[PDB]
Short mmCIF file of C-alpha atoms and ligand atoms in Angstrom, two decimals:
data_model
loop_
_atom_site.label_atom_id
_atom_site.label_comp_id
_atom_site.label_asym_id
_atom_site.label_seq_id
_atom_site.Cartn_x
_atom_site.Cartn_y
_atom_site.Cartn_z
CA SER W 1 34.36 -28.31 -0.30
CA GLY W 2 32.40 -26.71 -3.07
CA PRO W 3 30.98 -23.30 -1.79
CA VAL W 4 32.03 -20.89 0.43
CA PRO W 5 29.49 -20.98 3.25
CA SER W 6 27.57 -17.85 4.17
CA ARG W 7 25.34 -15.93 6.96
CA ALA W 8 22.74 -13.59 7.28
CA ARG W 9 24.56 -10.36 8.81
CA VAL W 10 21.54 -9.61 10.80
CA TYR W 11 18.78 -11.40 13.13
CA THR W 12 21.56 -14.74 12.17
CA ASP W 13 20.69 -16.77 15.12
CA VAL W 14 16.68 -15.95 15.89
CA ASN W 15 15.78 -19.53 15.45
CA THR W 16 17.58 -21.78 16.99
CA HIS W 17 16.76 -19.74 20.54
CA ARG W 18 12.75 -20.71 20.06
CA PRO W 19 10.72 -23.21 20.94
CA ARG W 20 11.27 -26.34 18.60
CA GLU W 21 7.25 -25.61 17.66
CA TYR W 22 7.71 -22.07 16.30
CA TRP W 23 9.79 -23.34 13.38
CA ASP W 24 8.89 -26.82 13.11
CA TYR W 25 6.01 -26.65 11.03
CA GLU W 26 5.29 -30.18 9.98
CA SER W 27 4.44 -31.05 13.77
CA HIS W 28 1.82 -28.22 13.12
CA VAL W 29 -1.75 -29.11 13.71
CA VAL W 30 -4.78 -26.66 11.74
CA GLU W 31 -7.26 -25.13 13.49
CA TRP W 32 -10.54 -25.29 11.23
CA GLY W 33 -13.21 -22.41 11.40
CA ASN W 34 -16.43 -23.03 10.27
CA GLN W 35 -16.14 -23.28 6.07
CA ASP W 36 -20.50 -22.23 5.80
CA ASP W 37 -19.12 -19.02 7.13
CA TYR W 38 -17.85 -17.81 3.73
CA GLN W 39 -19.39 -17.36 0.57
CA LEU W 40 -17.63 -17.29 -2.81
CA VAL W 41 -18.18 -14.33 -4.77
CA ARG W 42 -15.60 -13.83 -8.11
CA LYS W 43 -12.22 -15.67 -8.54
CA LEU W 44 -9.38 -13.14 -8.86
CA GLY W 45 -6.84 -15.48 -10.04
CA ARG W 46 -5.12 -19.50 -10.03
CA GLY W 47 -1.48 -20.45 -9.41
CA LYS W 48 0.13 -23.35 -10.30
CA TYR W 49 -0.57 -23.93 -6.54
CA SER W 50 -3.75 -22.48 -5.94
CA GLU W 51 -7.31 -20.81 -6.73
CA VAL W 52 -8.31 -17.41 -5.44
CA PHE W 53 -11.44 -16.07 -4.88
CA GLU W 54 -13.06 -12.53 -3.16
CA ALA W 55 -15.84 -13.99 -1.26
CA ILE W 56 -17.81 -12.31 1.74
CA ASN W 57 -18.10 -13.70 5.51
CA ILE W 58 -21.75 -14.04 5.66
CA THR W 59 -21.60 -13.73 9.80
CA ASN W 60 -20.47 -10.01 9.70
CA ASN W 61 -21.06 -9.41 6.10
CA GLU W 62 -17.28 -8.37 5.57
CA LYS W 63 -15.14 -8.62 2.51
CA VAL W 64 -12.68 -11.35 2.23
CA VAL W 65 -10.13 -13.36 0.31
CA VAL W 66 -10.34 -17.18 0.10
CA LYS W 67 -7.20 -18.73 -1.44
CA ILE W 68 -8.01 -22.55 -1.79
CA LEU W 69 -4.88 -24.86 -2.01
CA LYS W 70 -3.96 -27.38 -3.86
CA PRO W 71 0.26 -27.87 -3.61
CA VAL W 72 1.98 -31.28 -5.32
CA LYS W 73 4.22 -30.96 -2.02
CA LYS W 74 1.65 -30.49 0.69
CA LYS W 75 4.04 -29.63 3.56
CA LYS W 76 4.03 -26.38 2.03
CA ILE W 77 0.57 -25.87 3.07
CA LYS W 78 1.59 -26.23 6.88
CA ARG W 79 4.57 -23.77 6.66
CA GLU W 80 2.77 -21.48 4.71
CA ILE W 81 -0.13 -21.30 7.41
CA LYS W 82 2.55 -21.38 10.39
CA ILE W 83 4.46 -18.60 9.20
CA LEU W 84 1.09 -16.53 8.68
CA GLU W 85 0.12 -17.47 11.96
CA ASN W 86 3.90 -16.60 13.19
CA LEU W 87 3.72 -13.24 11.65
CA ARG W 88 0.03 -12.28 12.24
CA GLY W 89 -0.22 -9.00 14.17
CA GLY W 90 3.19 -7.50 12.70
CA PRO W 91 3.65 -3.98 10.73
CA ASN W 92 1.97 -4.45 6.61
CA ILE W 93 1.38 -8.17 7.12
CA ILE W 94 -1.59 -9.74 5.73
CA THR W 95 -3.83 -11.01 8.06
CA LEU W 96 -4.59 -14.63 7.88
CA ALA W 97 -8.06 -14.52 9.43
CA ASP W 98 -9.41 -17.67 9.03
CA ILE W 99 -8.24 -21.15 7.58
CA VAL W 100 -11.58 -23.55 6.93
CA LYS W 101 -12.02 -26.84 4.69
CA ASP W 102 -13.57 -26.24 1.75
CA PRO W 103 -16.43 -28.77 0.69
CA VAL W 104 -15.44 -29.50 -2.84
CA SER W 105 -11.75 -29.40 -3.15
CA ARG W 106 -11.44 -31.39 0.21
CA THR W 107 -8.41 -28.94 0.36
CA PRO W 108 -7.81 -26.18 3.19
CA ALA W 109 -8.88 -22.64 2.32
CA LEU W 110 -6.71 -20.00 3.87
CA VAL W 111 -9.17 -16.86 4.78
CA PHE W 112 -7.89 -13.51 4.61
CA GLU W 113 -8.41 -9.52 4.77
CA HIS W 114 -9.41 -8.29 1.98
CA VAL W 115 -7.48 -5.15 0.07
CA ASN W 116 -8.98 -3.01 -1.95
CA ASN W 117 -6.34 -2.86 -4.25
CA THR W 118 -5.17 -0.31 -7.23
CA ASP W 119 -3.59 -2.47 -9.96
CA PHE W 120 0.12 -2.02 -10.04
CA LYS W 121 0.48 -2.05 -13.75
CA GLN W 122 -1.86 1.29 -13.53
CA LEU W 123 -0.92 2.26 -10.09
CA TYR W 124 3.01 2.03 -10.58
CA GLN W 125 2.15 4.38 -13.62
CA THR W 126 0.57 7.18 -11.40
CA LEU W 127 3.25 6.95 -8.49
CA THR W 128 4.81 10.62 -7.55
CA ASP W 129 8.48 10.66 -5.82
CA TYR W 130 6.78 11.03 -2.24
CA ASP W 131 4.56 7.74 -2.67
CA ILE W 132 7.21 6.01 -3.89
CA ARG W 133 8.79 6.58 -1.05
CA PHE W 134 6.34 6.25 1.19
CA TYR W 135 5.09 2.89 0.10
CA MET W 136 8.62 1.48 0.07
CA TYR W 137 8.69 2.84 3.77
CA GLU W 138 5.76 0.25 4.00
CA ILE W 139 7.43 -2.48 2.23
CA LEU W 140 10.58 -1.87 4.69
CA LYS W 141 8.38 -2.53 8.03
CA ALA W 142 6.98 -5.53 6.75
CA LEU W 143 10.43 -6.95 5.57
CA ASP W 144 12.29 -6.16 8.61
CA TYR W 145 9.30 -7.45 10.74
CA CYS W 146 9.37 -10.78 9.06
CA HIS W 147 13.00 -11.17 8.96
CA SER W 148 13.23 -10.30 12.37
CA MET W 149 11.09 -13.19 13.31
CA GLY W 150 13.43 -15.63 11.52
CA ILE W 151 11.27 -15.48 8.48
CA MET W 152 12.33 -14.53 4.49
CA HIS W 153 9.62 -13.51 2.35
CA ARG W 154 11.40 -15.12 -1.11
CA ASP W 155 8.83 -13.29 -3.44
CA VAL W 156 8.48 -9.98 -3.54
CA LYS W 157 7.00 -8.67 -6.38
CA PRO W 158 4.66 -5.56 -6.92
CA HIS W 159 1.83 -8.46 -7.09
CA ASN W 160 2.60 -9.58 -4.07
CA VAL W 161 2.62 -5.65 -2.41
CA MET W 162 -1.15 -5.10 -2.43
CA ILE W 163 -1.72 -1.33 -1.90
CA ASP W 164 -4.86 0.40 -1.45
CA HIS W 165 -3.87 3.96 -3.13
CA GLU W 166 -6.90 5.27 -2.24
CA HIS W 167 -6.51 4.84 1.83
CA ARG W 168 -2.47 4.35 1.40
CA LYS W 169 -2.86 1.00 3.02
CA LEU W 170 0.21 -1.10 2.17
CA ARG W 171 -0.11 -5.22 2.90
CA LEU W 172 2.75 -8.04 1.94
CA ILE W 173 0.55 -11.18 0.77
CA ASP W 174 1.56 -14.37 -0.63
CA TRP W 175 4.06 -16.29 2.01
CA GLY W 176 3.59 -19.83 0.19
CA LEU W 177 7.14 -19.15 -0.68
CA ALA W 178 8.37 -18.07 2.57
CA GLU W 179 10.48 -20.03 4.81
CA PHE W 180 12.83 -20.17 8.35
CA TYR W 181 16.01 -19.04 8.34
CA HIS W 182 18.36 -21.08 10.10
CA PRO W 183 21.86 -20.57 9.46
CA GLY W 184 23.90 -23.44 7.46
CA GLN W 185 20.76 -24.20 5.52
CA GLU W 186 20.65 -25.36 2.11
CA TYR W 187 17.38 -23.62 0.21
CA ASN W 188 15.74 -24.29 -2.89
CA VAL W 189 16.76 -21.76 -5.98
CA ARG W 190 13.71 -22.30 -7.79
CA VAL W 191 11.94 -19.32 -5.71
CA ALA W 192 10.32 -15.58 -6.46
CA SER W 193 9.21 -14.84 -10.00
CA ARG W 194 12.12 -14.05 -12.97
CA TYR W 195 12.28 -10.88 -12.99
CA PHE W 196 13.15 -10.31 -9.34
CA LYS W 197 15.15 -13.45 -8.84
CA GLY W 198 18.65 -12.60 -6.58
CA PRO W 199 21.57 -12.73 -8.16
CA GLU W 200 22.27 -15.95 -5.69
CA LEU W 201 19.05 -18.22 -7.63
CA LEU W 202 20.50 -17.51 -10.76
CA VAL W 203 24.31 -18.70 -10.02
CA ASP W 204 22.88 -21.57 -8.17
CA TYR W 205 23.62 -20.45 -4.51
CA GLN W 206 22.06 -22.19 -1.75
CA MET W 207 23.28 -21.00 1.17
CA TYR W 208 21.26 -17.71 0.97
CA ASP W 209 18.72 -15.24 3.26
CA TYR W 210 17.28 -12.91 4.08
CA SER W 211 18.96 -10.81 2.10
CA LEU W 212 17.39 -12.22 -0.91
CA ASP W 213 13.90 -9.84 -0.33
CA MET W 214 15.91 -6.70 -0.18
CA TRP W 215 17.48 -7.51 -4.14
CA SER W 216 13.94 -8.24 -5.00
CA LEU W 217 12.83 -4.74 -3.20
CA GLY W 218 15.64 -3.09 -5.23
CA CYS W 219 14.28 -4.72 -8.77
CA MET W 220 11.01 -2.81 -7.14
CA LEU W 221 12.46 0.17 -6.43
CA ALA W 222 14.25 0.64 -10.15
CA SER W 223 11.18 -0.29 -11.92
CA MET W 224 9.34 2.54 -9.94
CA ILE W 225 11.95 5.33 -10.23
CA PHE W 226 13.08 4.77 -13.74
CA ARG W 227 9.70 3.95 -14.88
CA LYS W 228 10.73 0.41 -16.64
CA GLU W 229 8.36 -2.27 -14.95
CA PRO W 230 9.89 -4.75 -15.01
CA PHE W 231 13.17 -3.04 -14.76
CA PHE W 232 15.52 -6.61 -15.37
CA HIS W 233 13.61 -8.17 -18.36
CA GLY W 234 14.85 -11.82 -18.70
CA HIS W 235 13.37 -13.94 -21.26
CA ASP W 236 14.84 -17.43 -18.74
CA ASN W 237 16.41 -17.76 -16.01
CA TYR W 238 19.45 -17.52 -18.04
CA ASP W 239 19.00 -14.09 -20.29
CA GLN W 240 17.88 -12.95 -16.73
CA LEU W 241 21.44 -12.81 -14.98
CA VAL W 242 22.56 -11.34 -18.48
CA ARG W 243 20.44 -8.87 -18.27
CA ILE W 244 21.86 -7.83 -14.27
CA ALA W 245 25.07 -7.72 -15.92
CA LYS W 246 24.30 -5.55 -18.91
CA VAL W 247 23.62 -2.73 -15.92
CA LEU W 248 26.13 -3.93 -12.53
CA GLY W 249 28.79 -5.24 -14.83
CA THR W 250 30.68 -8.31 -15.45
CA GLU W 251 33.80 -7.68 -13.55
CA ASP W 252 31.57 -7.75 -9.90
CA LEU W 253 29.89 -10.67 -11.26
CA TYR W 254 33.19 -12.94 -11.35
CA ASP W 255 34.28 -11.21 -8.09
CA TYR W 256 31.15 -12.07 -6.28
CA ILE W 257 31.21 -15.90 -7.56
CA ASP W 258 34.90 -16.23 -6.83
CA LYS W 259 34.00 -14.87 -3.36
CA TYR W 260 32.30 -18.10 -3.01
CA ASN W 261 33.87 -20.50 -4.74
CA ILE W 262 30.58 -20.80 -6.96
CA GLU W 263 31.14 -21.84 -10.84
CA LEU W 264 29.03 -20.82 -13.30
CA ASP W 265 26.42 -22.72 -14.85
CA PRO W 266 28.73 -23.68 -18.57
CA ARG W 267 25.76 -22.43 -20.80
CA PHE W 268 26.94 -18.97 -19.46
CA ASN W 269 30.15 -19.06 -22.00
CA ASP W 270 28.76 -17.73 -25.24
CA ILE W 271 26.43 -15.79 -23.53
CA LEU W 272 27.29 -13.77 -20.72
CA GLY W 273 29.50 -11.53 -22.84
CA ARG W 274 32.12 -8.37 -21.14
CA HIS W 275 30.15 -5.75 -19.44
CA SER W 276 31.08 -2.58 -17.80
CA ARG W 277 29.39 -1.46 -14.74
CA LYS W 278 26.51 1.33 -15.81
CA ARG W 279 25.86 4.70 -13.97
CA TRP W 280 22.78 4.66 -12.65
CA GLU W 281 22.21 8.04 -14.22
CA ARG W 282 22.29 5.70 -17.65
CA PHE W 283 18.29 5.08 -16.86
CA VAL W 284 17.55 8.46 -16.44
CA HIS W 285 15.32 10.48 -19.04
CA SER W 286 12.98 13.71 -19.15
CA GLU W 287 9.82 11.34 -18.90
CA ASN W 288 11.29 9.70 -15.33
CA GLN W 289 13.65 12.42 -13.93
CA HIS W 290 10.88 14.03 -11.35
CA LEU W 291 11.16 10.25 -9.02
CA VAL W 292 14.64 10.48 -9.79
CA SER W 293 17.34 12.36 -7.09
CA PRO W 294 20.87 11.41 -5.93
CA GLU W 295 19.45 10.00 -3.00
CA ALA W 296 17.36 7.76 -4.88
CA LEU W 297 20.03 6.38 -6.90
CA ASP W 298 22.47 5.84 -3.67
CA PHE W 299 19.32 4.07 -2.16
CA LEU W 300 18.94 2.12 -5.17
CA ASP W 301 22.52 1.33 -6.03
CA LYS W 302 23.28 -0.26 -2.26
CA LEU W 303 20.10 -3.08 -2.50
CA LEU W 304 21.08 -3.86 -5.87
CA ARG W 305 24.35 -5.85 -5.05
CA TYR W 306 25.76 -8.88 -6.76
CA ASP W 307 27.00 -9.66 -2.86
CA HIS W 308 23.84 -11.00 -0.67
CA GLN W 309 26.32 -9.93 2.26
CA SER W 310 26.80 -6.32 0.91
CA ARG W 311 23.21 -5.10 0.96
CA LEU W 312 21.26 -3.19 2.95
CA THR W 313 19.33 -4.56 5.57
CA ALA W 314 15.37 -3.85 5.60
CA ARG W 315 16.48 -1.87 8.90
CA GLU W 316 19.49 0.04 7.76
CA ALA W 317 17.73 0.70 4.24
CA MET W 318 14.86 2.23 6.48
CA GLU W 319 17.66 4.49 8.32
CA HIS W 320 18.49 5.96 4.47
CA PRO W 321 18.38 9.89 3.51
CA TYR W 322 15.57 8.85 0.85
CA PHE W 323 13.12 8.21 3.34
CA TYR W 324 14.24 11.48 5.29
CA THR W 325 11.27 13.70 3.40
CA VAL W 326 8.80 10.73 4.43
CA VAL W 327 6.31 11.88 7.55
CA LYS W 328 6.16 8.58 9.85
CA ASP W 329 3.38 7.34 11.84
CA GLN W 330 1.72 9.38 13.20
O1 LIG O 401 -2.43 -15.36 -3.56
C1 LIG O 401 -2.24 -15.11 -1.93
O2 LIG O 401 -2.30 -16.10 -0.98
C2 LIG O 401 -3.28 -14.03 -1.88
C3 LIG O 401 -4.49 -13.04 -3.20
C4 LIG O 401 -4.48 -12.32 -2.27
C5 LIG O 401 -4.08 -12.10 -0.61
C6 LIG O 401 -4.99 -11.27 0.07
C7 LIG O 401 -5.47 -10.39 -0.18
C8 LIG O 401 -5.55 -9.99 -1.49
C9 LIG O 401 -6.55 -9.16 -1.76
C10 LIG O 401 -6.82 -8.69 -3.14
C11 LIG O 401 -6.25 -9.69 -4.28
O3 LIG O 401 -6.45 -8.91 -5.54
C12 LIG O 401 -6.16 -9.80 -5.63
C13 LIG O 401 -5.77 -10.01 -7.56
O4 LIG O 401 -5.28 -11.19 -8.08
O5 LIG O 401 -6.61 -9.26 -8.37
C14 LIG O 401 -5.52 -10.88 -5.20
C15 LIG O 401 -5.55 -10.25 -4.01
C16 LIG O 401 -5.44 -10.87 -2.60
O6 LIG O 401 -3.66 -13.28 -0.71
#
């Protein structure tokens, strides 16, 4: 017996009650649209697994985004497609409009609703206190939805939260790393993006859950209210934990690993050190003070916990006083 097991505290058993087909994405049969409906306009980016384009649907003259897939593990294709279909129409979830075969790649191309996004680096510099609260609530709607549907996003970060600021519209995108939560399942820790990786990933604890997304959201919040993007700025995955420990303290880190009977990579022996837990006020200064309130700090504090079991759930987060000032729809 190595690690102590763990379970999500909410939506724990949602998938087990489902028909197999809901989560057994390996058996999913892709429904294909017509590639000729779409004309590529310009490349937006390239990752290790895909290329993303702005495009036009020539049938309706509507802008769309086309992601042409190329993953090495090809079962990930069906996983992303099944998750997108399962979640389609949920609050603030990007809509998959079509799936077509690209004639050049001969691979699936996912067609999504367009978002006229403001670049996050520019945008975060302009967010007011009210805006941060507003958009955080919007992200929480999306996360509580997918969690309630038995799905963890696993790549929450600024790029994946597409905001059209002009129209105050938000969409959670790129479900390519998302997975179905099953109690007792051990998951790959090589997920999320460095600055947003939860302590569970960084200590190699595999039996994690929806609460991973809440750590990532906390990292986003900290970057927004303190105007420090990213907040925990590691050079690699090991330094990433050290950066966290310099804020949350090493004593609570050891309490966490001790709770789950986890051992740190011996790598940490001569780099981790001994750090006190810092008060959040440490990160406040004249340039970010207009974004900080006791409610902001308390909310942040309750997201950024080493113990994934201790973090606020998305629904609990929506109950927080931080959101009292936000006008709800509609
Ligand atoms: O990778 C995906 O799945 C993905 C990317 C996007 C998406 C859905 C809508 C989008 C809308 C605007 C964008 O601007 C960029 C940009 O990079 O500037 C990317 C995107 C994406 O899905």
